[PDB]
Structure 1
C-alpha cells in the first residue's frame, strides 16, 4: 500500500547560476542535492520530479534524479531580471500521484557582458582662452548595464590632452591641467576618453571630446620688418611712397592701425634739427610710408622714424601695441 508521500530534504533550496551558461549547465545548488524521500516500501517509494513556475521554461528537471539544468533554445540574461532572482516550485510525485513540494530560489550570477557605452559617443565644447589651472571644461559619462565591479567605471584620457587637460577618474569631469591655454598656440583639441569597467576581463568604451578654444583678443601685433634703412633722393617729391611697414596679429579679428610715433632729424654734421614731425607720413591701414615734406640733404641728411601698430580690437591694453616698434632710418642722398 501507499501509506506515505514524497518529502524533500529541504523546504527551500538555494541555487545559483551564472548568466550566458550553455544548455545543460547544471544549477549550482548550495544546500545539498535536490532530493525527496518517500517512506513506503518498493514501487510506492520511487519519486518523479517536476519543476513549476513563472520562468520554469528556462530550465529542465531530470524527472528521476531531480537535477536541474539550463534548457537549450534559451539564453539566461541577468540584465532581463531585476531583481536577478528566480523562484520556482519543486514538486515530487509517487506512482499513486501523492506528492510533496519544495522551493527553488535561484540567484542569477553576473557576467561582465556589457560594455561601458557613451551616449552620445561624441562631445563638442567651447572653452575660453586663458583659464586658470583646474578650470572645469565639461563632464562626460558612460553607462554600463552590468553590476558590482562589472558596472563600476574608471575614466581616463587615452590620447590628445598633451599635458594640458586632466580627467577625474570617478566623476569623468575634465578640467584644465596646470598649463596655459592659448588659442594662438592651439585653436582646438581632440581628446579620446576611455571609460573602463572593473570586470575580471575588463571592458572599455571610448568617446571623442573635441575642445574648441574661444578667442580673447590678447596677442600684440608684431612687425615683420622691425628695422629698415632706406636712402632717398633729395629730389623725392611729396606723396612718394618710400617704405612699407607690415605687421601680423594672430588674434581672430584684429583692427590694426599704423602710426608715426617720432621723427628725429639730423644735420650732415650730426647736429639735431627740431620740428620735423611732418617730414614723412604713414598710411593708417596699409603701413605704407610716404615722403610728405620736400627734402634737402644740407638741411636734414638723415631721419630716424619710429612707427607703431595698435590693435583697436584689443581686449587687453597691455597687448595692444607693438613691442618692439618699427624703426625706419631714412638717409637723404644728394643730387
Structure 2
C-alpha cells in the first residue's frame, strides 16, 4: 500500500517518427505523475523507464517527463505494429516501487518517396495501333501508410496527348492520335508517381517506346518532272537521265518501271510503237537510250515512270503518287 501511486494505471501516449532529441511525448492522459503514500511526511519520488524499446527515450528522473533520446531515430516503417509497451517505476527510498505502464503509438510521417523498380522501361509498339491500345503498365512502391502511400500516376513530358496514363492503375495507353513510325520512331516518356500526403513527394521513371514498322508509306520520287535534250546520234546504252525515289519504311524493295512512252514527230503528231526507245534500270532508276533514235521519225518523247515498294504491307501505298515524268526533246543532226 505504502508504495507511491500513479494517477493512471496505463498512460496512453504518441510521438511522430523522426522527432529530434528533446521532443516530449504527447501523453493523452494527464502528466506522468506519482506521489508518496504517506500524507504526513514528505518523500521524494523519482521516475524510471524500462522495456525492450526504452533505449529510444529518456525520462527526466525528477519530473517523469519522457523525451526522445540523442543518437536514436524513431522509424514508423521499422515497427509492426507501430505501438510500444514500456514500464514506468516510481521509487521512494525504503518503499516498494510504484507501477504504471506507458503505451506509445508511433505516428507515420510522409518520409518515403514513391519509387519505381525497375526505375526505367523499354517497350516495342506497332504503328497504326488504334486509340486506347494498352501499351505498358508501370508500378511504383511506397513504404508509407494511408494517404502517404496512396500513389497517383501522370505523364510529365514526351507525350503530347499521344499517350495517356490511368492516374490509379498506371496503365499507359495510346491517346486519340495516329502513331506513325515515319513521323516519330521512338518516344522517351518522363512518368511521375506522386503520393497524397500533405507534403507530397514524387518519384520518376523513363519509358522508352520503340515504334516498330509496318511497310505502309508509298515511295516518293525526288525528281518528278524533268525535260532532257538528246542528240539523235546517241547510241543505245547511253544514260540520259535518272529518276530517283525514297520509301521511308524500314526495308523497302524499290522497283522502277516505264508505264508509257508517247512519241510525236516534228509536226507534233502521234507516232506509235516506239516503246523500244528507252529503258529504266529496275533497281537504280537510271534511264538509257534503248533503241536507235531518229529525229526525222520522232522529235519528242513523253515518258512516264513509276516506282513500287514490293515489300509494302499496304497495297494502296505501294506506288509513287505522282509517277515521274520525263520529256525527251530530240536534237537534230545534219551537214
What TM-score bracket applies, with the shorter chain setting the length?
A: over 0.9
Cα shift at 1:89: 1.7
Q: CA RMSD in A?
A: 1.7
Deviations 1:170-226 (A, max 9, x none): 222212111111111111111111122222222121122222111111111000011
Cα shift at 1:43: 4.9
Cα distance in 1 for residues equivalent to 2:282 and 2:125: 34
Alignment check: 8 A CA contact 1:234 1:297 kept: yes
Cα distance in 2 for residues equivalent to 1:134 and 1:90: 62
Q: Residue in 2 aligned with 1:193?
A: 191
Stretch of structure 1 that moved more, 61-70 or 243-252: 61-70
Q: Residue in 2 aligned with 1:8?
A: 6
Stretch of structure 1 that moved more, 39-48 or 303-312: 39-48
Cα shift at 1:119: 1.7
DSSP-derived class of the 1:43 partner: coil
Cα distance in 2 for residues equivalent to 1:246 and 1:126: 32
User: Structure 2: which 5+ runs fail to align?
Assistant: none
Cα shift at 1:325: 0.5
Alignment check: 8 A CA contact 1:192 1:208 kept: yes
Alignment check: 8 A CA contact 1:140 1:172 kept: yes
Q: Structure 1 45/315 Cα, relative in aligned 2: closer, same or farther at 3 Å?
A: same
Cα shift at 1:63: 2.4
Deviations 1:140-184 (A, max 9, x none): 222222112222222222212133211221222212111111111
Cα shift at 1:38: 4.1
Alignment check: 8 A CA contact 1:44 1:96 kept: no
Deviations 1:272-314 (A, max 9, x none): 2222222211000110011112122232221111111111111
Cα distance in 1 for residues equivalent to 2:39 and 2:6: 17
Alignment check: 8 A CA contact 1:17 1:107 kept: yes
How many aligned residue pairs are there? Answer: 332
Query: Structure 1 length as normaliser, TM-score?
Result: 0.94
Alignment check: 8 A CA contact 1:156 1:193 kept: yes
Cα distance in 1 for residues equivalent to 2:175 and 2:28: 52
Cα shift at 1:45: 5.4
Cα distance in 2 for residues equivalent to 1:240 and 1:62: 107
Alignment check: 8 A CA contact 1:229 1:329 kept: yes
Q: Residue in 2 aligned with 1:147?
A: 145
